[PDB]
Amino acid sequence: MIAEFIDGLQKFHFLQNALITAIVVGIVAGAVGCFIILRGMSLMGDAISHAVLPGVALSFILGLDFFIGAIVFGLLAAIIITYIKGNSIIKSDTAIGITSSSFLALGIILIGVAKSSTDLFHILFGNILAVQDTDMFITMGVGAAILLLIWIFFKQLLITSFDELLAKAMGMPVNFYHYLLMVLLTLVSVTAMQSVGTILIVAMLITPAATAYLYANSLKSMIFLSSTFGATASVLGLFIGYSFNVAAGSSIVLTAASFFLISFFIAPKQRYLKLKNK
């Protein structure tokens, strides 16, 4: 079972593209995911994943680039979320719930009129085994762009995530780096559609990062661990789905969930259960 998987990666061109795409998604989603959970944006990660769908669908029929539509509809949601709060008694979480599900429903309608039933199922859940070369190289390009952007603004993202009140006292544009992460989040979301699909994007952001949060002693250490857990969980899940003939996206997420479950007990910081016991 392990032997023929290695053999398949040598023969087949579709399994090679599945491996490289799964790796890159796992690395980049886990890297961005660190900032998502540290800044308290776990909900927003799920909301933007849903808000991107109608933009990706509308960008297809118009004949435009997939990443452009994701940002427009991704920002339209964030505008509405803030606009609902600012002009009514509707709470924040309710505004995020209404706008995310409404955009999700809109996306399903726009996909249905243009594309087939199998395309909708794949957009929502994965299709890692049928990614083309152009999609693979663009995923590497945009994925590497996300990483080097974080590398450039690492010091600025550090203070704003840890101590935003100190950043404001120094005169830093805290709003600029908030929108930067949301611009990066949309690029991760459309990239993650290939492996885990629209419905399970949130898992690839928060689950590896949450696991790395239990171990890491620094932001750099946390990103490295979050990407390693995400990348490893992406490879194992591919091996699980391909061999046992089960959903690749769910297998990838369950592997990440099991890493969190194992780490929840065996992590040094988690072994402060002795504190609560006595």
């Binding site: 203070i159 009140l165 830093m172």
Partner: protein
């Protein structure tokens, strides 16, 4: 010279601060005192421009908002997330980030400042350690070391002595006394009414309005205090 002129703040409908006008000369260690939740902490935020406010504030002719590099702000320990993954030296190094431009990193020059700041506050052995693995006193000294590396002419501390041991309290106060000797204004929002004449040479008693302001002996009196804490309605 700090220069506040008709500064006001409103968190929700009601006024947190009401027409604040003041001119603070230095060097000094000035203590902002009064009821907790009445304006003490909001003044430092409104002064810096961290929150919306109706009014202006200046630092030696030039405006506060256009001279933030000259100021250093040390917020309360409650606001900071202790569980965040960051070492002590890495937390202190954050004060230098404004001096570093984009596409540039911390050379050996900058890390030397960080370790010296820790040697002053007495945490040279805690540099390679998590901020979660510290006491309230020790963590406060890290925030003061983070303040030192900015080399700010003005220092704003929000309840620094709230919930710390006497060993840390003395080390912190020695550091602030050195900053006073360097010729710099140190403005501190105090958490209670403890050691007022010992710590502070000037006092700013705040309860929405400015109740009293001046030298400690002259202003730190039962008449002024009971007007503030009694809210203009103190009965004997």
């Amino acid at each position: 010279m700090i220069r506040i002129e008709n500064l006001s703040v409103s968190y929700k409908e009601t006024l947190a601060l009401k027409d604040i006008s003041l001119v603070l000369h230095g060097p000094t260690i000035t203590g902002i005192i009064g009821p907790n939740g009445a304006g003490k902490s909001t003044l430092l935020k409104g002064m810096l421009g961290i929150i919306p406010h109706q009014g202006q504030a200046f630092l030696d002719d030039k405006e506060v908002k256009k001279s933030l590099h000259r100021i250093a702000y040390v917020e309360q320990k409650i606001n900071i997330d202790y569980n965040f993954p960051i070492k002590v030296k890495e937390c202190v190094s954050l004060g230098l980030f404004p001096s570093i431009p984009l596409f540039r990193s911390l050379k050996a020059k900058h890390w030397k400042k960080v370790q010296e700041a820790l040697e002053i506050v007495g945490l040279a052995d805690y540099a390679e350690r998590q901020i979660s693995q510290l006491s309230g006193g020790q963590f406060q000294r890290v925030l003061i070391a983070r303040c030192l590396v900015q080399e700010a002419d003005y220092i704003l501390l929000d309840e620094p002595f709230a919930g710390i041991d006497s060993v840390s309290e003395e080390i912190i106060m020695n550091t602030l006394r050195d900053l006073k000797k360097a010729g710099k204004t140190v403005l501190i929002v105090h958490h209670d009414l403890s050691k007022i004449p010992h710590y502070f040479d000037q006092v700013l008693l705040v309860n929405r309005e400015v109740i009293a302001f001046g030298p400690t002996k002259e202003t730190f009196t039962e008449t002024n205090l009971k007007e503030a804490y009694g809210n203009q309605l103190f009965f004997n």
